[PDB]
Design an enzyme around this catalytic site. Structure first.
Site, PDB file in Angstrom:
ATOM      1  N   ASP D  92       0.880  -1.135   0.000  1.00 32.11           N
ATOM      2  CA  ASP D  92       0.000   0.000   0.000  1.00 32.11           C
ATOM      3  C   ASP D  92       0.918   1.183   0.000  1.00 32.11           C
ATOM      4  N   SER D 117       3.159   6.371  -0.235  1.00 35.05           N
ATOM      5  CA  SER D 117       1.924   5.890   0.286  1.00 35.05           C
ATOM      6  C   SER D 117       1.091   6.074  -0.896  1.00 35.05           C
ATOM      7  N   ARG D 118       0.648   4.942  -1.433  1.00 28.52           N
ATOM      8  CA  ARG D 118      -0.127   4.874  -2.625  1.00 28.52           C
ATOM      9  C   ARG D 118      -1.457   5.521  -2.392  1.00 28.52           C
ATOM     10  N   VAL D 119      -2.010   5.238  -1.207  1.00 31.20           N
ATOM     11  CA  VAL D 119      -3.238   5.781  -0.716  1.00 31.20           C
ATOM     12  C   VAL D 119      -3.287   7.272  -0.500  1.00 31.20           C
TER      13      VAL D 119
END
Lengths: 161, 264, 131, 128, 156
Positions: D92, D117-119
């Site tokens: 993630d 942080s992909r999110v």
């Protein structure tokens, strides 16, 4: 990823498959359940998924990273099989949106070892090619329609060679 | 080499790449400014040359290299080096002043013995008139037996071009008194000298500035150059790299099979 | 007229401008060098450059030093070591410097030393003069 | 469990690197095919299933959490190493820590540039 | 490749080419630094050969160090003498380039074989660097250097 990668995809589905009344398949292969989840609502949200209509321009098949590799891999075939339904049977240009054909690839290789095979280069299945060939060769434009395959491509080793 | 090594290489080649690039734009930044600044100046020094320009005052009879302290990022130093060695025989006076101590390289031996002075911190903020005056000033108080002096510098010509110059210094103020220089008024060996003075800086400034313009631009070029070079190499290696890289892997996996697995 | 080059290393005010006159305090003297001078060389006294362009306007600058050289031909080149407008010249400093200048002078020494002050005195004064 | 007890858990898996080693080791002892980079293929799956088991849940279910902090200790650039690669494909985001920076005294170490942080924003406080 | 590695043991003279060189067009294109006869010796070969060879091997090698440098630079920084040697080294190279009869057919370029002494002399001269002024291509693809000298003039 996730630039609205998906947005674009969604949009793509929208743009053509609506426009030109085609259909779409998203086969989320090996994906994060989460990402399929996200997407799901995202389609829901987009309205491209309609929950009031199962003629949301996409049929979804997911075979997330928790199934046997082959199984996840085979979610690919599944999607194909469906899309084949829509092409030949529905006479259509089916769009086959695939994420990730790589993950599939890895999966093929994954079984091979265990299959007692000697899976060739990079550990890759020797039949990497045949796997590819046969599936890819399933994809085309029949006289009945098209399965236009839009294949999401993960960059293994940030390389493609 | 072994892939590691390759990387070891690579790492640095990039670093280099950057570094080269760093200079490149940096130099260019300095440059960028510098060229603009040249305007009043250019003109100005071009101005300096007024007089001979008109009433030209030439005798049957110094020299002075001018440049940066920094290398030959062009043929700056070497050029003058050449032509000043070319000189030294001929008789002016073999007094040299080297602006740039990369002058003091190219010629530096009995140009540890033909100089009057040499200048340094040439750049590091582009030269200014002050300097010109500065260098002018002490120059004055010099044991030149103010023959016919030359100032050889590289007058920049354009981004991509410079010319190694000379001008002659009518250091023989008397040629500066002579001839055609007569019609001239305020003719006193005062304002004469006291122009010669002023012009020594003016010219100096200019020339120097030219030199430096040249320096900054050739360097600029050089600093590009390198960085494309880097790139290329990176390309070359990188393949060979991978290839070996995986190749490696592969073998072990090979070995791993049938060497550690089938038969071990 | 004259290519009047009023230039300074840093500033060219006039550039071969057909100016009628520059009044020009070379240390030689203050003169009204008019459009197209005689070969003459001039040392710039600090003074003002009064730049009678062919325009009625005569521009002020105060000049520190340099040369105007008023040529055989019609080129006049004020090559100002530094010639600046009173606009940017601070009386507050100038005068202040100048009183001081003499003050410092009082404790100065040789022809030169005194000079450093005196030159300044002279200078600053001539600025103060000017403004 | 906690997640299902609408409770919010933090698991730090420190470190799968060691786990993998063991698992392979195990495989091998089991005389079983391991896989890529000598390590079992479904050690990915292993982990995949493991990590698939971590989640942010509908609230309806108590919607607890299991927040997972896996750790892998690099041996540097060997992210290429199968398991890191795996993990990368799973993750993630990744927290790249920059030791060099640490040495520079830059502590936190972080190679921020590679940290991701992909999110991003859903896990972010508006404040922030 | 170990196999060739092994092979070497059975060798007692070797011609190790350089495709690397070859790519540069070159015939003959060699790895010079392992093109051998083990019995490379000033006694065995005359010393003239030998020494010349050692010198050659030296310069060329040194040059070999240098390209790398040049590549990572220019050649400018690098002492001009060296630049000279570098150049010479190529010349030597070019002079080593020897074209053949059977492949005049291919090359459009004369076939050549060179008696040794003229050879020793050849390289030795280049080593004496007097010739230096003359171009690489004069050196390229010749038999005796003399012909190269001829070709240089002719080039000019």
């Amino acid at each position: 990823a996730g630039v609205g990668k998906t947005v674009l995809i969604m949009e793509l589905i929208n743009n053509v498959a609506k426009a030109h009344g085609g259909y779409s398949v998203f086969a989320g292969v090996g994906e994060r359940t989460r990402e399929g989840n996200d997407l799901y609502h995202e389609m829901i949200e987009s309205g491209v998924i309609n929950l009031k209509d199962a003629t949301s321009k996409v049929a979804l098949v997911y075979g997330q990273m928790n199934e046997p590799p082959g199984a996840r891999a085979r979610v690919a075939l599944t999607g194909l099989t469906v899309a084949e339904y829509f092409r030949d049977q529905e006479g259509q240009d089916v769009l086959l949106f695939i994420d990730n054909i790589f993950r599939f690839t890895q999966a093929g290789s994954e079984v091979s070892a265990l299959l007692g095979r000697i899976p060739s280069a990079v550990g890759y299945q020797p039949t990497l090619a045949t796997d590819m060939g046969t599936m890819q060769e399933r994809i085309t434009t029949t006289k009945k329609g098209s399965i236009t395959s839009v294949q999401a491509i993960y960059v293994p080793a940030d390389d493609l060679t | 080499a072994t892939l590691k090594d390759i990387t070891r290489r690579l790492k640095s080649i990039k670093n280099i790449q950057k570094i080269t690039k760093s200079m490149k734009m940096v130099a260019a930044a300095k440059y960028a400014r510098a060229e603009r600044e040249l305007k009043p100046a250019r003109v100005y020094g071009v101005g300096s040359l007024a007089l001979y320009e008109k009433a030209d005052i030439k005798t049957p009879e110094l020299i002075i290299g001018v440049s940066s302290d920094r290398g030959l990022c062009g043929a700056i130093h070497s050029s003058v080096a050449k032509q000043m060695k070319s000189e030294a025989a001929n008789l002016k006076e073999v007094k040299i002043i080297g602006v740039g101590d990369k002058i003091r390289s190219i010629l530096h031996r009995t140009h540890s013995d033909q100089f009057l002075v040499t200048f340094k911190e040439v750049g590091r903020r582009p030269p200014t008139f002050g300097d010109a005056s500065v260098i002018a000033l002490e120059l004055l108080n010099s044991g030149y037996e103010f023959d016919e002096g030359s100032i050889i510098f590289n007058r920049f010509r354009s981004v991509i071009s410079y010319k190694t110059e000379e001008k002659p210094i009518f250091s023989l103020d008397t040629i500066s008194s002579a001839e055609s220089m007569s019609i001239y008024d305020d003719i006193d060996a005062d304002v004469l000298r006291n122009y010669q003075e002023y012009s020594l800086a003016n010219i100096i400034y200019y020339s120097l500035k030219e030199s430096t313009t040249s320096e900054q631009s050739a360097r600029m070029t050089a600093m590009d150059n390198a960085s494309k070079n880097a790139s290329e190499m990176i390309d070359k290696l990188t393949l060979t790299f991978n290839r070996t890289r995986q190749a490696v892997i592969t073998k072990e996996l090979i070995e791993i099979i049938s060497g550690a697995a089938a038969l071990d | 007229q004259m290519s009047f080059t009023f230039a300074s290393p840093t500033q060219v005010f006039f550039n071969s401008a057909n100016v009628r006159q520059v009044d020009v305090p070379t240390q030689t003297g203050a003169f009204g060098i008019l459009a197209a001078h005689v070969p003459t060389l001039q040392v710039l006294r600090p003074g003002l450059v009064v730049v009678h362009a062919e325009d009625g306007t005569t521009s002020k600058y105060f000049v520190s030093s340099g040369s105007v050289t008023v040529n055989a031909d019609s080129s006049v080149q004020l090559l100002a070591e530094e010639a600046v407008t009173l606009d940017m010249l601070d009386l507050g400093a100038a005068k202040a410097n100048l009183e001081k200048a003499q003050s410092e002078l009082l404790g100065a020494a040789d022809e030169a030393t005194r000079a450093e002050i005196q030159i300044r005195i002279e200078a600053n004064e001539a600025l103060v003069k000017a403004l | 469990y906690f997640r299902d007890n609408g409770k919010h858990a933090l698991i730090i898996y420190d470190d799968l690197s060691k786990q993998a080693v063991a698992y392979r080791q195990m495989s091998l002892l089991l005389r079983r095919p391991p896989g890529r980079e000598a390590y079992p293929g479904d050690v990915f799956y292993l982990h995949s299933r493991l990590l698939e088991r971590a989640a942010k849940m509908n609230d309806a279910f108590g919607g607890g959490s299991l927040t997972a902090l896996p750790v892998i200790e690099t041996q540097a650039g060997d992210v290429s190493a199968y398991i890191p690669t795996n993990v990368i494909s799973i993750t993630d985001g990744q927290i790249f820590l920059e030791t060099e920076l640490f040495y520079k005294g830059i502590r936190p170490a972080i190679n921020v540039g590679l940290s991701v942080s992909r999110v991003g924003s859903a896990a972010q406080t508006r404040a922030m | 490749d170990p196999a060739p590695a092994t092979t070497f043991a059975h060798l007692d003279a070797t011609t190790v080419l350089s495709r690397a060189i070859a790519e540069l067009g070159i015939y003959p294109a060699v790895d010079p630094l392992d093109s051998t006869s083990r019995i490379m010796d000033p006694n065995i070969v005359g010393s003239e050969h030998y020494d010349v060879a050692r010198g050659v091997q030296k310069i060329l090698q040194d040059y070999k160090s240098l390209q790398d440098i040049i590549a990572i630079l220019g050649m400018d920084e690098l002492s001009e003498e060296d630049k000279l040697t570098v150049s010479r080294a190529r010349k030597i190279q070019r002079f080593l380039s020897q074209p053949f009869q059977v492949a005049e057919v291919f090359t459009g370029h004369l076939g050549k074989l060179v008696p040794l002494k003229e050879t020793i002399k050849g390289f030795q001269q280049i080593l004496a660097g007097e010739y230096d002024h003359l171009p690489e291509q004069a050196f390229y693809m010749v038999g005796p250097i003399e012909e190269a000298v001829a070709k240089a003039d002719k080039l000019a």
